[PDB]
Amino acid sequence: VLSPADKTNVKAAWGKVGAHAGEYGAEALERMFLSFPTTKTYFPHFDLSHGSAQVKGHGKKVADALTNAVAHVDDMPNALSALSDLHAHKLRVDPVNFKLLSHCLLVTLAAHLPAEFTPAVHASLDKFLASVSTVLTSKYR
Amino acid sequence: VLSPADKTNVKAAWGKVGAHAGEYGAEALERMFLSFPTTKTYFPHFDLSHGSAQVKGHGKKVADALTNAVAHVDDMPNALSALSDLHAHKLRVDPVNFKLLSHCLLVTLAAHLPAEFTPAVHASLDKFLASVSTVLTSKYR
């Protein structure tokens, strides 16, 4: 469960991301495909090279979805509804993969926010990213 | 989330367990300790030899708690309340281990309920142990 101190930490950190959200989104993905080669099996149609526009474009979608998640932190299941139907009925990405993106997202944040990536903010972001993951896979079965 | 069909499926299979729940709980644990040896790190203070009183007792404790969860399946959080606190503040078992016990409880059940362990009951059982595990872990952080 996300506490009020959690919700504050997240809003504050995601506030700094700002207009770089799209850019952080893409680096996180790149971090994922390089560190966890198995995740690439879901993008056989993309050019996965560094500087890829396809990666860039998807990085932007992801990041915007989370900006959406942050805006609706107390009503996440409704905000992410269409996204949770999509991955459960069409994409069908194995649940283990949400942990791998979540960690790459975290490392991307750490590398860009030297002053804001406190031990406590680190803990609320990891909690927040597990709740997004839980919502997105809630309809798998 | 568990559908209505799921709840019917779980109540039906657990019915058959009936009186053996306690012996089933012991066999599942012994299967866990043997297939997954790292789970033994949480029972250094137990005599883990086959047929030990400590295992059989614990086995019975675990089954009672499942039966309770089966009886109050429309309100698990509230029913397992005391159990979440204990595991969250005291025991502090890493969440990965709930998956391995869940698996050995499923193997136990397959082995003892030939007639009832259909494809559809197996799915409901697996969703059911995943919810129990989620409940048991919900106060970790």
Place this chain on the structure above:
Amino acid sequence: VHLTPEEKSAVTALWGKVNVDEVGGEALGRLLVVYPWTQRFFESFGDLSTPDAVMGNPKVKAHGKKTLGAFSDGLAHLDNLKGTFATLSELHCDKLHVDPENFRLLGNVLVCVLAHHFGKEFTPPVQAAYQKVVAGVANALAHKYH
């Protein structure tokens, strides 16, 4: 994998009793019903709408026997799993795009099926032996991923 002499004997003695086609179809079937996301690869198989649909799907049954056949032949090479599955590992990665996580799921489903089929003869130590075998195969099948 590392199995003692006694672990291999257990494994081979039980397997001797297996109807491959029969268990092949059942395990693949259960995977598809218990972990529906695994259905993504099987769109050309046809009707997968219900548990009965899946379990009665000839496409599923035939996939299941080909799958478990390959497993079955790997049992003869417990000392060299990687060597035996290296080509299959490459196919899975480069052409089929299968997340290795699927391999861990089938392994578990497989162990549930032997338990269902063997009842009490599937003892705790026999499980354990088989748990290594399954982990072994999944690791071997994931080793050429890149």
Place this chain on the structure above:
Amino acid sequence: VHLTPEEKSAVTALWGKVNVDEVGGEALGRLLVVYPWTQRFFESFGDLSTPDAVMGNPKVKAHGKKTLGAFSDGLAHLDNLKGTFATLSELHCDKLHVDPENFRLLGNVLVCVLAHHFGKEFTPPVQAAYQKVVAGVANALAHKYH
């Protein structure tokens, strides 16, 4: 672990800039804050009640230093992680009762701290190399469990 010439040089060059004293105290402090259940192994350290408490705790600091220093010796023997950590492996299992899963969590927190400390110097390809290192270190530590 298997590392390309580029990966070995990546790992090695960054490690050279690290002060084990402080990266260690940080990684451990963060493990205890982000995954509070790991605090079960450190009841004797005292007050781990608030993020500020854990971080300023001197026992956490000394310990983190001890851990990372051992970690450092492994970089030097990246070719035989198993043989290098065998003693500590037995210790963590037999005497300490540490679920090996904890090794994985620590590995992940350490990557986070490297990113945070170094920023844009810690690029994707550098990350990936360091992901291989930590995973191999974790497997090396869990090796003698039984």
